């Protein structure tokens, strides 16, 4: 049993049982009784080590315990758990030495009850999940198994807050092969939240580091402010302002209303979406001519300022032939009708973006070669046929920019000036690992190659879009398809995982523009309230791949956007401790209040 006191915090670490605990400002947190730090293969505790060494350490930078673990059959690794002098933070390092996952640090005890002490997780826009919450919240119920750099982990942190206002945030400083793990039992007494780490390309390769910061007199607002600061203290908090200094078009997205509609549909036979009764469900076409007149009419009706995202615009048809997604669909009016539509949009003060796809790599593609595809760490090629274009694998992001550069050249060759562009999935799904000797790529590398893809667009004054908003992309992404809450991605019938809190826009409102769902759910929540509280852009039309007081509703949300769209969301609060009735405050003092009993808002 070692003990360390440094810079206002105290660390405790048990020599023999491995359970560690920290304290600062008189609040103690502790590893749960009965959860071992583990390794996995086809589960061994750390204590399972044939040899275990512990060395007390004082460096000029902090103090703590280094531990070596050999054994298990031959394998070895190391942990370093220390207090940083400058700040008071505790840092946990797992250190390869030479295995499927690593679950370490072991989760902190946050049992139990007391409806007001909450877990904050980062699964899409925030989820504030109180310890007494009725519904079960597990990792199986979280997108992509709770994996950072995805929809299941918008930001590489989680946090636990007590009624006391005594919190800890946990920041993953090595996210690219990592995620968090959540166990909140239905109505549970406790919520346990823990970090997990996977090998990169078959091997734990690089050290993995978690940074804990204990907070006192703490808000959920404040917990997000800590991360924001961490991010900027590392130069990855890219504002719209910074983006705007390079491409002022960023400013033209404020106040805009979103129209998402498409041109061609063409479900293939091998596709999961194919049924033989009937075709015509499998084939549909709306022409450029029709979308022209659509956009015409929306202006005439007073829709206002608009951005048109255009699905299915190329010849093979929506979700077909990627990356050979050329030419612009003939049967809808070829390059010409497309050219004419784009012209028309600009001609009435409206913006336009293409829908494109560079991860999904179809066999039906004109240029398909298995030589350009992903190979997993076991050297296999992944295959599915979930989507419209049928059989596919994934294109190694190592080759992604080649294809972005080639395609958008062709597009521009035909007098088409894209305002924006949407490269699909990049910002929602995980980075691939690629083991192909001819283009080896780690998950870290994959996000950089995706960002290189975005940056080519930015270089051509073409704004940037993708599915969702995983923070890796923050420096190269202008806007998204949405940054919704988890509950908006489930049937409104589904029991929810917690209180919706805008944890993300708390961190990035002033960095990435998001359109929002405008739906009303019968017998419940109007999704306009969430757009408001999140100071976002409104959807007017949202035609899915698989007007009626709308304009009047949009123009409310749009107007607030123009005022606030680039500003920091400084505060979000729950009016009088009640989960419904929430307030969010922006940089310029604007307070959007939203009553969830009354379905009302106040601007």
Considering beta carbons, is residue 146 or 353 the nearer one to Ca ion? 353
Residues 547-576 that bind Zn ion (CB under 5 A): none
Distance CA 588, CA 581 (A): 21
| CB closest to Ca ion, residue no | 355
Query: Which of helix, strand or coil describes residue 299?
Result: helix
Residue 396 binds which entry of Zn ion, Ca ion, none, CB below 5-8 Å type-dependent: Zn ion
> Which of 84, 89, 93, 398 lies at the binding interface for Zn ion (CB under 5 A)?
398
Distance CA 374, CA 381 (A): 6
Considering beta carbons, is residue 157 or 394 the nearer one to Zn ion? 394
Considering beta carbons, is residue 191 or 271 the nearer one to Ca ion? 271
- Residue list for the binding site for Ca(2+): 260, 309, 311, 355
- Residue list for the binding site for N-acetyl-alpha-D-galactosamine: 319, 360, 467
* Closest approach of Zn ion to the CB of residue 359, in Å: 12
Instruction: List CB contacts of 177: < 8 A, sequence separation 6 or more.
Output: 197, 198, 199, 200, 208, 442, 443, 444
- What pairing do the DSSP bridges indicate for beta strands 537-542 and 44-45? unpaired
Residue 497 binds which entry of Zn ion, Ca ion, none, CB below 5-8 Å type-dependent: none
* Closest approach of Zn ion to the CB of residue 370, in Å: 11
Residue 434 binds which entry of Ca ion, Zn ion, none, CB below 5-8 Å type-dependent: Zn ion
| Location of structure tokens 């709770």 | 146
Distance CA 585, CA 578 (A): 17
Distance CA 39, CA 35 (A): 12
Residue 65 binds which entry of Zn ion, Ca ion, none, CB below 5-8 Å type-dependent: none
- Residue list for the binding site: 260, 309, 311, 319, 355, 360, 396, 434, 439, 467
Judged by the rule CB under 5 A, the positions of this chain that interact with Ca ion are 311, 355
Distance CA 501, CA 161 (A): 14
Q: Does residue 396 bind Zn ion (CB under 5 A)?
A: yes
**Phi/psi of residue 170, each to 5°?**
-120, 115
* Closest approach of Zn ion to the CB of residue 372, in Å: 8
Buried/exposed 140-155: b ≥16 CB within 10 Å, e otherwise: ebbbbbbbbbbbbbbb
Instruction: List CB contacts of 423: < 8 A, sequence separation 6 or more.
Output: 356, 357, 358, 404, 450, 453, 454, 457, 464, 465, 466
Distance CA 21, CA 110 (A): 12
Instruction: List CB contacts of 300: < 8 A, sequence separation 6 or more.
Output: none
388 within 8 A of 443, measured Cβ to Cβ: no
* Closest approach of Zn ion to the CB of residue 528, in Å: 44
- Residue list for the binding site for Zn(2+): 396, 434, 439
Residue 355 binds which entry of Zn ion, Ca ion, none, CB below 5-8 Å type-dependent: Ca ion
Considering beta carbons, is residue 446 or 531 the nearer one to Zn ion? 446
* Closest approach of Zn ion to the CB of residue 393, in Å: 11
Residues 432-451 that bind Zn ion (CB under 5 A): 434, 436, 439, 441
Q: Which two tokens stand for residue 305?
A: 């300022």
* Closest approach of Zn ion to the CB of residue 204, in Å: 21
Note the Cα 282 to chain centre separation in Å.
Answer: 31
* Closest approach of Zn ion to the CB of residue 378, in Å: 14
Considering beta carbons, is residue 436 or 497 the nearer one to Zn ion? 436
Applying CB under 5 A, which residues contact Zn ion? 396, 398, 434, 436, 439, 441
């Amino acid at each position: 049993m070692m003990q360390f006191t440094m810079s206002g915090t105290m660390l405790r670490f048990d020599e023999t049982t491995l359970r560690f605990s920290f304290s600062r400002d008189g609040a103690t947190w502790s590893g749960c009784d009965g959860i071992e730090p583990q390794l996995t293969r086809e589960s061994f505790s750390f204590a399972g080590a044939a040899t275990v060494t512990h060395e007390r350490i004082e460096t000029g930078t902090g103090v703590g315990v280094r531990s070596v673990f050999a054994g298990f059959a031959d394998y070895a690794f190391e942990t370093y758990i220390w207090i940083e002098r400058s700040s008071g933070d505790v840092l946990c390092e797992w250190v390869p030495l030479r295995i499927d996952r690593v679950l370490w640090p072991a989760p902190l005890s946050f049992d139990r009850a007391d409806a007001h002490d909450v877990t904050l997780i980062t699964h899409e826009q925030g989820v504030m999940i109180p310890n007494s919450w009725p519904t079960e919240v597990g990792t199986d119920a979280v997108s992509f198994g709770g994996r950072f750099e995805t929809a299941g982990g918008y930001m590489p942190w989680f946090a636990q807050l007590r009624s006391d206002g005594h919190a800890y945030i946990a920041i993953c400083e090595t996210p690219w092969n990592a995620g968090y793990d959540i166990d909140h039992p239905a109505g549970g007494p406790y919520t346990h939240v823990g970090m997990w780490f996977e090998p990169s390309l078959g091997r734990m390769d690089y050290r993995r580091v978690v940074r804990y910061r204990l907070l006192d007199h703490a808000d959920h607002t404040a917990i997000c402010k800590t991360y924001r600061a961490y991010v900027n203290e590392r130069g990855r908090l890219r504002t719209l302002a910074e983006k705007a200094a390079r491409n002022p078009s960023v400013r033209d997205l404020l106040g805009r209303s979103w129209v998402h509609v498409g041109i061609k549909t063409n479900v293939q036979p091998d596709s999961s979406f194919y049924d033989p009764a009937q075709p015509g469900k499998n084939d549909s076409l709306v022409t450029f001519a029709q979308r022209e007149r659509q956009m015409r009419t929306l202006h005439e009706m007073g829709a206002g300022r608009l951005y048109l995202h255009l699905d299915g615009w190329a010849q093979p048809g929506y979700d077909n032939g990627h990356p050979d997604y050329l030419p612009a669909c003939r049967e809808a009016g070829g390059w010409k009708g497309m050219k004419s539509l784009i012209d028309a949009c600009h001609e009435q003060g409206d913006l336009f973006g293409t829908h494109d796809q560079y991860r999904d790599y179809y066999f039906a593609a004109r240029t398909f070669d298995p030589r350009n595809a992903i190979r997993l760490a076991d050297g296999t090629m992944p295959e599915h046929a979930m989507w419209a274009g049928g059989r596919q694998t994934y294109l190694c992001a190592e080759l992604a920019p080649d294809y972005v550069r080639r395609n958008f050249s062709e597009i521009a060759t035909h007098g088409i000036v894209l305002d924006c562009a949407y490269l699909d999935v990049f910002t929602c799904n995980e980075g691939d690992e690629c083991s192909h000797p001819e283009h080896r790529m780690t998950r870290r590398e994959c996000y950089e190659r995706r960002a290189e893809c975005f940056e080519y667009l930015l270089a051509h004054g073409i704004l940037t879009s993708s599915e969702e908003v995983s923070d890796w992309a923050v420096p190269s992404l202008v806007f998204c398809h949405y940054a919704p809450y988890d509950f908006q991605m489930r049937s409104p019938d589904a029991p929810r995982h917690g209180i919706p809190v805008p944890l993300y826009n708390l961190v990035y409102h002033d960095c990435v523009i998001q359109p929002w769902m405008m739906d009303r759910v019968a017998g419940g929540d109007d999704y306009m309230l969430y757009a408001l509280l999140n100071g976002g852009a409104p959807y007017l039309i949202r035609d899915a791949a698989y007007t009626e007081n709308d304009i009047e509703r949009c123009a409310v949300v749009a107007g607030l956007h123009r005022r606030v769209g680039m500003q920091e969301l400084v505060r979000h609060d729950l009016v009088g401790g009640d989960p419904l009735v929430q307030r969010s405050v922006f940089a310029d003092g604007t307070a959007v209040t939203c009553d969830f009993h009354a379905q009302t808002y106040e601007v």
